[PDB]
Ligand binder design. Structure first.
Ligand code: H7D
Length: 358
């Protein structure tokens, strides 16, 4: 890599790893469209396995960007409409609070207070139906944003229903394979387990547990190389040959709602570039990112703005990830770690790197 990129990345990430006691980390910088890779530390402390460019990390909520794009692709295919009522794809959802709740509301956390987590008690499909039937909204649809796995998770499950494919099969054939993300998985195959990093929580090696709607809300594992390719694809969707996928990427970066200085896409979240770093850094703390906040509808949604800071944080019990990119500058970053360390530390490091390069 250019010594500029090397010095900028190392001077930022080295203190971050020491301050946060991160066992292993991989970083990709996309600069003028090309990726540059950096790795540190251990994928498996006990077996002394280093992080490499082939190490798989749990993406956590960064998975929601894949779900948003897969949904965008289903829209582009004409299989679903974001204006469709939820009940069009789940007719068994007969309880009256669902009147007026559309797929858009599910995709953007604005259905009226769906909870952050699906209860652990829920497992079978009938458990899930019962949960949603019994759920009582605190707010009318489209008035408040409350970040929720039970919201975008249901969107992902419903979005693939007309295709007849399972969510995993749809993701594989319509997103992963066209983009040549050949080391990106919802379920890690036995052949790839050698590369699956352990996560570390209170010093214990952990992997994400199965849960309802896990594939759709937090289920993807990927390498730093595939994630850099994911950033490149979202930076320049028009270079993608599959038409509905190119269109779906664009739909996921449209601005549907505004709260404060941030705009809600499908999975992706966006701010106008240049950004106030304190806005994205402090805004990434869970104190703000998970709070109930009033939203203004963007009527109609703004198409993908090239002069945006587009990003998503993600975590599981043992992992912490961040992706941010600026289409106007052909500039982006992926940070994958096998510890869940605080969101503001992620965004601060990413902004330092990208600001120095733009
Ligand atoms: O990634 C995140 O940013 C979310 C933030 C929501 C509140 C904190 C928990 C972390 C969470 N991860 S998760 O919701 O995707 N998923 C839940 C079970 C395992 C991982």
């Amino acid at each position: 890599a250019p010594q500029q990129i090397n010095d900028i990345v190392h001077r930022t990430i080295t203190p971050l790893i020491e301050q946060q006691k991160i066992p292993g980390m991989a970083v990709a910088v996309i600069y003028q469209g090309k990726p540059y890779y950096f790795t540190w530390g251990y994928a498996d402390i006990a077996k002394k396995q280093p992080v490499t460019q082939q190490t798989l990390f749990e993406l956590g909520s960064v998975s929601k960007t894949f779900t948003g794009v897969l949904g965008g692709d289903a829209i582009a295919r004409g299989e679903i409409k974001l204006s469709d009522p939820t009940t069009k794809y789940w007719p068994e959802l007969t309880a009256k609070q669902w009147n007026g709740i559309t797929l858009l509301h599910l995709a953007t956390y604005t259905a009226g207070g769906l909870p952050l987590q699906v209860p652990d008690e829920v497992k079978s499909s009938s458990d899930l139906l019962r949960f949603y039937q019994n759920w009582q909204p605190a707010w009318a649809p489209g008035t408040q944003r409350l970040y929720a796995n039970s919201s975008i998770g249901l969107f992902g499950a419903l979005a693939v229903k007309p295709s007849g494919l399972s969510f995993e099969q749809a993701m594989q054939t319509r997103v992963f394979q066209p983009l040549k993300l050949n080391h990106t998985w919802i379920n890690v195959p036995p052949a790839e387990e050698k590369n699956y990093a352990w996560g570390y929580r209170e010093g214990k090696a952990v992997h994400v547990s199965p849960g309802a709607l896990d594939a759709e809300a937090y289920g993807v594992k990927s390498t730093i190389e595939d994630m850099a390719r994911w950033v490149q694809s979202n930076l320049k969707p028009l270079d993608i040959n599959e038409k509905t996928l190119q269109q779906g990427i664009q739909l996921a970066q449209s601005r549907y709602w505004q709260t404060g200085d941030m705009y809600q896409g499908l999975g992706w979240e966006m701010l106008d570039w240049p950004v106030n770093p304190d806005s994205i850094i402090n805004g990434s703390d869970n104190k703000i990112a998970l709070a109930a906040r009033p939203v203004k509808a963007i009527t109609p949604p703004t198409p993908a703005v090239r002069a945006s800071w587009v990003h998503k944080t993600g975590a599981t019990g043992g992992f912490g990830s961040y992706v941010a990119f600026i289409p106007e500058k052909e500039l982006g970053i992926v940070m994958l770690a096998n510890k869940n360390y605080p969101n503001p530390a992620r965004v601060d490091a990413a902004w330092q790197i990208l600001n120095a390069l733009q």
